[PDB]
């Protein structure tokens, strides 16, 4: 009869009212549910106390806050209103680098994970440049190339860079509509020897992430906090005891 | 003449004005009662001080806050505006699992506490699948089945799952009207050798739980805080010394 | 010429302007007096500074806050707008207990401090039930009886309970009008070898207790905080040096 | 050129514009002066920045906060808008005590510092009561007498109390008009070997004490905080370099 | 490329637009510059996101906060809107003391730093009073004289005091117009081996000191905080790269 | 699947929509991104709960906060709305110092980094003054010269100062329009063995620095906090999965 819960959360997106495929939202550090009710009050005046005598509720709302520490692209799509874009690995053969380059300039490439970088000189007789005259910062992860030097007989300035780029996953900002996801919290209550508890929320509309600290200070893992409103599902039976907002199952 | 109280709280629901059956609300960590009064003031002006000279009360209200650590279904019905639903244990024989299943898929079952799980293959000659090809996560408490593999001669994809499910208790969200409960606080005052004290509140209208942290951090047991207004009971005698809001009994 | 005061407070209720009988308010932990004044200001404009040049007071008010740790019925009547009700000890002979009782049911009695409990069986030949078949929780202080068992030949269900109940004192909620009490603070100033100090407040109108924690956590004694306004007494002489709000007497 | 000041404050009341007699305000723990100015701003718009270009002051005010720990009657008159009343020591011969007195009653006398208390019995033959039948609580400082017992042949109930009372000083609440006092702060700056500093405020209008804790907790001496506005004196020369609000003198 | 600055501040008053003589503002503990900008925003509505698409600034303001610990008269004139008054040392010959003086009275003199105090008796034959009959409190720094006694043949009450007073510097309250000062912050950046940095603010309008604690508690030197607005100078070239608010010079 | 990021930030100014040259913003201590959304809600009323049933977003905005500790002129131009001015080293030959100079006066020169200072006397026969009669405070970094003395035969007062000044870089206050910069955050996630992460923000409009403490206390390096709004870029494809606000690339 005491609660200290630890467990997992499964989310299923709702598209045009058809149930989606459940997925694990990965690690979650905090889950909170808050209930709000509006009440209209009636006061009697026969006792001289002008005090409250009755009240009936008019409003009913529920909010859910979730703190997730996973920065996976699947979760980014759900939290950033984005849609995942997958780019397959490939090669570049005739990319043209900026002109008027001199020692000290930093060239930014269009793709990441560059490898086997080659820069052919522009001339009737192609002459690949010596690798010792350029360096790859951040082991080519950021696609940045630094010029270390140039031969005394200055070669033709425009260059032709060819290389290989690895596959990547990208998420756009505000590129998807407001997601609607059904939530299933499967938890273990340690206070009762690890008893099972299940919480079902049929329809939830989420709110974008509020803050995202890209450069963190301290020993705390970056956290992503999402707020959402539990909407009223109109498909479930009205008279059923399961309600229309959410339900809790405890085995006993 | 000093107070440090520890005790129990009994609640009796009020339905259409007829007293209900008292029940223990289980463990309670904090109880507070607050009184609010509105006053209209009259100021004299013959002394030149334009100061207050009289005041009479117009409003009278009382609020009660209770912090309970019990997550029992009976308390969930009272705090979540829900009504308890009891499901008896039973069996399933012809549940159909999703199609196009492959290794790695997770199948969610409609009932919890699954045991003796059997998945018959779809064919003119029934052939139950080998148990080694599937696993039960969370010992079947959450009703989740993981596929470990499939025979090289891929069997018919649609499946027929049969198993046994245990009884459960469920609580809906906002599925019951605003409860009205009479409260009896029976406490022991340790400052006076454990003297008995009784507090009676005739009519209280409760407010849903504000927050419920499903995943808790630290060493603090999950707490459920409920606020309520003590309404004016119109059935008790008006001139009686017991009043109409509440009373306190101290043996002495 | 320094103040660190410890002392007692005596209160005399004011009914229709006739002085009441002084009583000690028991232990008090904190007393504070605050003065509020409203001022209307006049600004000159001949120097170019448009600054304040005069001010005269229009309003005058005084508030008093008292923290008392005594939960005595006399103080409850003063703080809860209640009136004390005394119930003398007595006996009950033919109280009828609820029907359809079975093992595990808890019966609540109308009076507290039950002793010599007897439950006669309903039949043409009265047959008191064996005491071993019932138990008294909380040594009968709360008037709760638990059924331990029933004879195999189930006796007549309706019962007739007779017992003895002790005297008690009760306080109603908001059952009395706004008290008006004159206050006398008799204190000792330790900074001057324990010099005597007296503070007189002629007329004070109190405000109900704000909070009352029935179940306390920690090592702090329950506190009852009361606010009040010091009204203007119209009976004292206007020109007298004693004023009409309050006075302080210091022997020296 | 550094300031850490400790010193004394002298106050001279202003009555109808005639200087009063300076007195020492006793111990003071904190003194603060705050300046407030109102400004009207003009913004140019030829540069496209729509930014501030000029400002001139319209308002000018100064406030002073003083924390004094002396509860002397002279300071009480200044802080409570009161006027001191001196009562000379004397005697009482025929004071009548309340009737229907019994053992346990507490009699409150009109004067403090009672000594040589005598209670003559009401009868044709006066018979002073035995001292052993009554006691003086708080060594008669509060003027409280407790009855210890009565002779079996109950004497005449009405009594005639005679005793001696000492002189006292009293202060009324809001019994004097808004004081106007000129302030002289004579301080020593320790940062410069104890250099002398003088601060003169010509006209100050004070604000009643905000809080006065009669029963104190901890090891902190009771403090009395007073706020005041420094008014504009119209008697000093307008063109003089000494101004009209206040001045500072530093010897050097 | 890191900043931890320590340095000096030079201030030059601006009178009718003509540059004043720079002076050192003495010790300064903190300097802060804040920039405020107002922006008007334009939102597009063709994407359905009703989000921000453009913004242009309309307002531009800059504020400066300085904390100085010097209480020198030159700084007092700048912070208190005062003008310094210098009084040369001199002598007094025929000052008349208050009449009706008795033992215990304290006489306040018009000048400070009194020395060689002489009080001639009023009579046809002048008779200076014995020095042993009077004392000088605070070694005459505050100009206070205490009477120790009087001869049995009471001399003529009115007195004639003559003495010597030292020179002093005084500052009036709100006796000068709103100063306008150009500021030059010459600082050393320790993070770069003590590199030089210069900050120029052409026109600043200051705000009076907010608080001045004459009697300080703790081990903290009294601080004087001044706020000011950096106005737009209309004399500098509009197209120049030095701007019109302020500039920073870093040698490198 | 966990984030603790450390990395670099590259900024490219946007002028009339043409991409600028990327530069490193130097050391950065904190980066935060916040998302704001406005929603319009629809409530049904057929269930009697008058609760939320639908919501659609109308507003979309994103803000970015960056804390940079570099006080380089390039960053000053970006944060102060300034434009860098470079002054080359040079010489001065006929600068005229203020007249009526005496011992103790401090002369401020128009340029910094003074060296080989010479002050020729005004006379028909030029006579350079002896160096021992003047001193250079702050080793001439601030361009301040102090007079140590003058010959008994007072030379001609007006002077002619010649010296050498070093090159400098200056930044004006509010001398440039609102910058628009594209941001590229290249970070390493230590939680995954140092995995690469890239964050692209296409269009950001910055807000001036709020505070700049020129004189710092403690052991904390001076910080420069800048806020900005991520605007909607209208050049990128509308249907592309990269969106129009920003994107995140994670290699995997």
From TrEMBL, chains A, B, C, D, E, F:
Organism superkingdom: Viruses
InterPro entries in the cross-refs: UCP028589
Protein name per the record: Virion structural protein
Organism expressing this protein natively: Pseudomonas phage JBD30
């Amino acid at each position: 009869t005491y609660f200290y819960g630890q467990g997992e959360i499964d989310a299923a997106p709702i598209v045009n009212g058809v149930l989606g495929k459940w997925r694990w939202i990965q690690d979650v550090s905090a889950m909170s549910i808050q209930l709000a009710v509006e009440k209209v009050e009636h006061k009697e005046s026969y006792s001289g106390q002008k005090a409250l005598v009755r009240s009936f509720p008019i409003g009913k709302t529920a909010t859910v806050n979730i703190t997730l520490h996973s920065i996976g692209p699947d979760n980014l799509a759900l939290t950033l209103y984005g849609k995942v874009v997958a780019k397959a690995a490939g090669s570049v053969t005739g990319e043209v680098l900026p002109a008027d380059l001199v020692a000290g300039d930093v060239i930014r490439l269009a793709n990441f994970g560059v490898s086997e970088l080659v820069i052919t000189d522009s001339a009737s007789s192609p002459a690949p440049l010596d690798p010792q005259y350029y360096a790859l910062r951040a082991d080519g992860a950021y696609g940045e190339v630094q010029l270390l030097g140039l031969p005394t007989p200055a070669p033709t300035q425009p260059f032709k860079a060819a290389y290989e780029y690895a596959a990547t996953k990208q998420v756009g900002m505000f590129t998807a509509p407001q997601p609607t996801v059904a939530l299933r919290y499967k938890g273990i209550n340690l206070a009762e020897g690890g008893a099972p508890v299940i919480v079902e929320l049929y329809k939830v509309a989420t709110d974008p992430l509020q803050e995202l600290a890209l450069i963190s200070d301290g020993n705390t893992v970056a956290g992503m906090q999402i707020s959402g409103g539990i909407l009223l599902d109109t498909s479930k039976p009205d008279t059923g005891d399961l309600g229309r907002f959410g339900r809790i199952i405890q085995l006993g």
